[PDB]
Ligand binder design. Structure first.
Ligand SMILES: O=C(NCc1cccc(-c2cccc(-c3cc4cnccc4[nH]3)c2O)c1)Nc1ccccc1
Ligand SMILES: [Ca+2]
Ligand SMILES: [Cl-]
Ligand SMILES: [Cl-]
Ligand SMILES: [Cl-]
Lengths: 55, 248
């Protein structure tokens, strides 16, 4: 898994590492799930989400 | 915005309205509780900075509904490479005097990492542009916030399909004169959806072109400025509202 292809599988941000290693990351107000790819909100009004449509 | 629709109230919650002495100046994009991104050219003619106001949660300019939040602008930051009256490096970073309060109606747009924006967001075809600008070329501005879905072009394809685009810009929209961002919309967001979240990829800039047949809308390519913006957002404010900051 490489960041330039398919975003490395990452929902948000992606870093290539030493080896065949990849680390996904999430913006502030989100945390990375144990799948290593998904980001879930940790605050009420995370960036880039439309509250009336999330509800 | 020409040829779009009303953004339903609350669905464009990162949109900012900029006012000078109460008059509509430009749009903007909230990216955190004290930070707004807009277009440098919006500020070329300001005499007194204390007259500049940013409004969040705005929707219908004819009414007050209580979701609006107004702030003074403590800093307007412009890249050193921007020349007043031109299109290149048409970006500004605005520091609000006091944070806005996040609500259902006021939410920041995510400023992406550069790599993600260049490698992934730049290939999302369609993105949303919004503002209270003119509904048509040489027409009246909108009372309700408008939004328009526009397709992005690779720059070679823009030059070919057109009847001066630098690496700091990109083209998006349509060449048939039906659909474009317009005067009054400058500084507003070009927002791109990826995997359930929206990101800032462009800023409405300017050209002679408001839905001009044979021409595409021109947008400041925000990916070129991510590092510049991040650095400024970690910096202490300086006396005097206008600041020119080195770019890169
Ligand atoms: O006057 C200077 N700045 C003030 C200032 C403020 C706010 C808005 C504008 C402004 C003026 C006219 C057209 C557009 C426009 C066309 C267009 C098409 N498509 C999308 C958006 C678009 N916006 C526009 O945004 C100008 N600079 C200046 C000039 C001449 C010389 C030196 C400096
Ligand atoms: Ca209102
Ligand atoms: Cl204030
Ligand atoms: Cl730093
Ligand atoms: Cl500093």
């Amino acid at each position: 898994l490489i960041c330039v292809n398919e975003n490395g599988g990452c929902e948000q941000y992606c870093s290539d590492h030493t080896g065949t290693k990849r680390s996904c990351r999430c913006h502030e107000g989100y945390s990375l799930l144990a799948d290593g790819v998904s980001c879930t909100p940790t605050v009420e009004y995370p960036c880039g989400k439309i509250p009336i449509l999330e509800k | 915005i020409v040829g779009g629709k009303v953004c339903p109230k609350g669905e464009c919650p990162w949109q900012v309205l900029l006012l000078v002495n109460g008059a509509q100046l430009c749009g903007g994009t909230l990216i955190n509780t004290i930070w707004v991104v807009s277009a440098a050219h919006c500020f070329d003619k300001i005499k007194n900075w204390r007259n500049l106001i940013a409004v969040l949660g705005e929707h219908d300019l004819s009414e007050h509904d209580g979701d609006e939040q107004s702030r003074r602008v403590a800093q307007v930051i412009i890249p050193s490479t921007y020349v007043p009256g031109t299109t290149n490096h048409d970006i500004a970073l605005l520091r609000l005097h006091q944070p806005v309060v996040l609500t259902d109606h006021v939410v920041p747009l995510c400023l992406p990492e550069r790599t993600f924006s260049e490698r992934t967001l730049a290939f999302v075809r369609f993105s949303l542009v919004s503002g209270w600008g003119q509904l048509l070329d040489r027409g009246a501005t909108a009372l309700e916030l408008m939004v328009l879905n526009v397709p992005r072009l690779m720059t070679q394809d823009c030059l070919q399909q057109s009847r001066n685009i630098t690496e700091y810009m990109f083209c998006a929209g349509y060449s048939d004169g039906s659909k474009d961002s317009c005067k009054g919309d400058s500084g507003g967001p070009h927002a791109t959806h990826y995997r359930g979240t929206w990101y800032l990829t462009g800023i409405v800039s300017w050209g002679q072109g408001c839905a001009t047949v044979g021409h595409f809308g021109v947008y400041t390519r925000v990916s070129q400025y991510i590092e510049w913006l991040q650095k400024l957002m970690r910096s202490e404010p300086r006396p005097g509202v206008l600041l020119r900051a080195p770019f890169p």
